């Protein structure tokens, strides 16, 4: 509906019950999640490998 | 970009002083694609774009 109508509408009509509800598609959320997680794990792994390299040297 | 042979690229950085995502319009080097990372500065690596 035309944007200035949204003003009238109830919250539920304007969004959806999810993280990034009504701003982003479901597909690209669940990728974000697992990207964010799989990225963070590799940072932790690299941090561990760095710490092992410090202990070695 | 009208009246320009070349294509441009909207390239988004993060402003390193305010929490804010600045954006630029580079001239697209050939071989650029979307969802690529573009690195830039003195300690930038020598690849395209």
């Amino acid at each position: 509906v035309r944007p200035k109508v949204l003003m009238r509408l109830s919250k539920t009509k304007k969004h959806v019950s999810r993280a990034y509800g009504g701003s982003m598609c479901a597909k690209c959320v669940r990728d974000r999640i697992k990207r964010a997680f799989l990225i963070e794990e590799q940072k932790i792994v690299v941090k561990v490998l760095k710490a092992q390299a410090q202990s070695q040297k | 970009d009208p009246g320009r042979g070349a294509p441009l690229a909207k390239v988004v950085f993060r402003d390193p002083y305010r929490f804010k995502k600045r954006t630029e319009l580079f001239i697209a080097a050939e071989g650029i694609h979307t969802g690529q990372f573009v690195y830039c500065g003195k300690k930038a690596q020598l690849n395209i774009g």
């Binding site: - | 993060r14 390193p16 002083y17 305010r18 929490f19």
Partner: protein, 241 residues
């Protein structure tokens, strides 16, 4: 125990491309208003440019201990304020028709103030000491004055602050000051001061005349030259010697 398990560290790595930089002080890189920027880089020209000696001599100001002695001595001879002036007149008006009115009594000695009073009583050798402010705004007013004083043999000095010189008298600023006479009790202190001043200014005026003095470079420029000289030094010093 008084150490909650939850309380962590969470340290921020202010690297490059890492966590956004902290709000550090930028006073050095501020874009200043044109007035500020101007008044700042005026002082830079006076350092950078080859300043001629008649203007330079106003850098050689009086030292701290001496200055506080001088201003102590003047405190005796601060000229009459308002109200005091009225009381001097009012008392005289009352005494004329009451209990014998002489008229002139005997007036005490005081400071003399602005350049024009001073120069007429350096020409005339009436002054014993001349205090000059270092920071008169269009210098010309006081440029000749130190050359003049030394010609008439009048002890002269350059105090800091045209303001603090002007606070002796009760005005905003004053260019100059001079003692024509001093009371017998305080005469010896003035005489002590006078000799100490003239050794530092009048009795080395030839050196003051010769002494040019700006021509200093920026520290950023200087540092580069010294680094270049250290490169030239290490090119031919550690090799042979």
């Amino acid at each position: 125990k008084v150490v909650n398990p939850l309380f962590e560290k969470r340290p921020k790595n202010f690297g490059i491309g890492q966590d956004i930089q902290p709000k550090r002080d930028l006073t050095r890189f501020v874009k200043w208003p044109r007035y500020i920027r101007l008044q700042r880089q005026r002082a830079i020209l006076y350092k950078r440019l080859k300043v001629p000696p008649a203007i330079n001599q106003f850098t050689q100001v009086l030292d701290r201990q001496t200055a506080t002695q001088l201003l102590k001595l003047a405190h005796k001879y601060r000229p009459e304020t308002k109200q005091e002036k009225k009381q001097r007149l009012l008392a005289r008006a009352e005494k004329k028709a009451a209990g014998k009115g002489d008229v002139p009594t005997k007036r005490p000695p005081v400071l003399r103030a602005g350049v024009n009073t001073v120069t007429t009583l350096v020409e005339n050798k009436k002054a014993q000491l001349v205090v000059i402010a270092h920071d008169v705004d269009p210098i010309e007013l006081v440029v000749f004055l130190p050359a003049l004083c030394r010609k008439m043999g009048v002890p002269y000095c350059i105090l800091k602050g045209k303001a603090r010189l002007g606070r002796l008298v009760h005005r905003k600023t004053c260019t100059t000051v001079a003692f024509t006479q001093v009371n017998s009790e305080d005469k010896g202190a003035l005489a002590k001061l006078v000799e100490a001043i003239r050794t530092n200014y009048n009795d080395r005026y030839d050196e003051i005349r010769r002494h040019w003095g700006g021509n200093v470079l920026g520290p950023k420029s200087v540092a580069r030259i010294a680094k270049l000289e250290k490169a030239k030094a290490k090119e031919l010093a550690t090799k042979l010697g």
